[PDB]
Design a protein around this ligand. Structure first.
Ligand SMILES: CC(=O)N[C@@H]1[C@@H](O[C@@H]2O[C@H](CO)[C@H](O)[C@H](O)[C@H]2O)[C@@H](O)[C@@H](CO)O[C@@H]1O
Ligand SMILES: CC(=O)N[C@@H]1[C@@H](O[C@@H]2O[C@H](CO)[C@H](O)[C@H](O)[C@H]2O)[C@@H](O)[C@@H](CO)O[C@@H]1O
Ligand SMILES: CC(=O)N[C@@H]1[C@@H](O[C@@H]2O[C@H](CO)[C@H](O)[C@H](O)[C@H]2O)[C@@H](O)[C@@H](CO)O[C@@H]1O
Lengths: 218, 218, 218, 218
């Protein structure tokens, strides 16, 4: 069992760099590590992974995804690493990650996200590493990181953070307090000022309530 | 806290690419993932990892190691991934890996290994992935892979296999039998003929007893 | 979501000691630890566990199972502990355990096993503990423990080992050499002579070929 | 190697029921599961476990410990189950459990604890099961369970909860809210009214602020 375009042995399936335009059929049920990265996949069918309950790592980075079906990861209860970096997402459905209670690494950089849904990470009690850098994020919803007790590495740089708007105060206070975990590069390197306000290029960590106004919020 | 040159958060310590000449002091005891790769480390003190029992991943690839103290990994009972690729090793001490009973990935490519000690891998019951490519190996000892029952991926290419000598018959037989797991690249791709006789450019797995002679052994 | 008769919280489902005659419906898909022991279950529906792929521990001990459907554990790739002790089995279907590649504890004591299928344990590479005591075993198939390299604990006592028959020599030779792992009790206690010949009270590990004859075998 | 009083194979050491008055010498450094239960151990040397970094399960239950040195569990970073049930502890040093970031079951029942230290469980992010039943507890410190996001099973019965005192209100409000995880027996069975006020036999989760007064707090 192995899609003809891929290499498969043991519990690892390598479909990387194969000019794939869709997720191939015949990925074994027993697969733990799935490389689908660096292809030209433009969409996921709902249910494409329903059958792949055993996955520990899902590598989807460097594809062309423009949206993700709601529920698409819902059977992945064992998933430990989810790499979605360098796709073309502009948003994420609510509840996307709620079933990924064992997730330890989540990569969401280098796309075009304009916001995150309000409860996006609330179930990710084991999450350690979270990559949000290089998107179009202006704010982080209030409380968004409050249920991430295992978090030790985060990436926030290269987002047009809107520091004139009162919405930024959650993040700006959070970064000030969790400043040892804010970084850049791969693997992570400590970089606490790397989250910067749009237009002023000043640190998000240094924004005050005085310098913001409800009137600056869209 | 953290070695001065490195970034540390959670249980991950990143000292990669820091022009290091030795293994820095102050790596916390709780470290699980240690990146020491891409430096200019020339040697390891005996005992350097004795206080790092919690390591799961040890990235030592791309350094200048020429030998390894015997027993240097002996405390690493939880070690799951050991990357020694691209160092300058010409041999491995006997018993080097014997304590590593939970090892799942072992990278030994791209150095100058001229042989393997006879029992090298006997204890690695859980080893899934083994990289031996790009060395100076002419032969594998008889029975060398017999006690690697969990092995699903192996790299053997780019070694001067000496197929005129009768010693090559263990390996040639083994490769023919375990064809499905022999490969190339990162991540692994199926490539069972990548192991070639030096010169004749015949695949190792196609060698017959008839073409070999004990008189051609060094 | 929880069977009415059971208690459920997190990923543990306790249906133990509930006077059940069958496996109840409504066991969540996310269940990792499933207690069905100490009931009056007499049989399993084929497919009963097809949906429970996240199981790590399956406690079926102290029921009244007389047979097991083939393929019944086939979807349990993450299974780590399987406890079938004190049921009423007289045999096991071929390949019953083949998909259980992560299995670390397998209990099969205290039933009515007359034999084991030839390759029963061949895939259980990570098996550490195996309980075969208190059955009706006369011999172990030649080679039956050869593909159990992770094995550190085994129980063999209280079986009518037929020491007149030459088939016992696999076992007797194996025990003599793996003597440190043979034992008794819960948790295990070292007990190398506990496995004894039927009628003679002679330890199985001391049997000689001189006392046995192919003429006394099946 | 094994202590002479005990039985050992693989990574399990069985010193249970051996009339031990102290922790014996010669427990291997590679030990993962250590049974020191049902002995007559009355204290632990500071540093006794410093060398046992690989422990996953520590069974210390049914001895006669009266105190525990602070720092004693500090090197047990991999510890997943800690069983201290049925000793004679009346208090726990502050920070006792702070290094046990991977602990999933903690048994503290059936002793003489008269209080818990304020931040006792603050670091136990993965704690799933916590046994506090059968002690001398009158209240639980404010916020004590707030940093146990993984907690799915708790035992609180058979404690003389002082419901007349305002200090009970954290606990009563907590039990009402987390009612589905409150239980009894082994394995856990659901039993939310099992925690009862002394004298009144009123479930703790049913206490009102009106029935309590800061004047009844000694
Ligand atoms: C997408 C890419 O450029 N490379 C991948 C790595 O990317 C990094 O991810 C972290 C965490 O999400 C962070 O956002 C970095 O800025 C980003 O480069 C990483 O996802 C790995 C996973 O193994 O794959 C690519 O190398
Ligand atoms: C630059 C280098 O050596 N690459 C490392 C990766 O490499 C490969 O390792 C596999 C497994 O042994 C095989 O030998 C390949 O030929 C080799 O390129 C891989 O080990 C990663 C994991 O950290 O490290 C480097 O990237
Ligand atoms: C009576 C019974 O089946 N007890 C179960 C325990 O039994 C021990 O199991 C081991 C290994 O199979 C060995 O066979 C012993 O003889 C037997 O007593 C044990 O399996 C536990 C596991 O949680 O369940 C019952 O207690």
């Amino acid at each position: 069992a192995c899609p003809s375009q891929c290499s498969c042995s043991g519990t690892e399936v390598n479909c990387a760099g194969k000019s794939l335009a869709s997720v191939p059929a015949g990925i074994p049920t027993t697969t733990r590590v799935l490389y689908l990265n660096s292809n030209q996949i433009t969409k996921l069918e709902p249910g494409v992974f329903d059958r792949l309950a055993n996955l520990r790592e899902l590598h989807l980075w460097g594809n062309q995804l423009v949206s993700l079906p709601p529920g698409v990861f819902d059977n992945l209860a064992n998933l430990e690493k989810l790499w979605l970096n360098s796709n073309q997402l502009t948003s994420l459905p609510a509840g996307l990650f709620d079933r990924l209670v064992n997730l330890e690494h989540l990569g969401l950089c280098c796309m075009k996200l304009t916001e995150l849904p309000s409860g996006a990470f609330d179930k990710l009690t084991r999450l350690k590493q979270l990559g949000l850098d290089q998107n179009q994020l202006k704010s982080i919803p209030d409380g968004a990181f409050a249920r991430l007790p295992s978090l030790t590495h985060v990436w926030l740089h290269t987002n047009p953070w809107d520091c004139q708007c009162t919405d930024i105060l959650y993040l700006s206070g959070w970064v000030a307090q969790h400043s040892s975990i804010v970084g850049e590069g791969w693997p992570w390197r400590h970089s606490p000022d790397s989250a910067k306000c749009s237009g002023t290029n000043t640190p998000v960590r240094a924004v005050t309530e005085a310098s913001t106004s409800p009137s600056k919020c869209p």
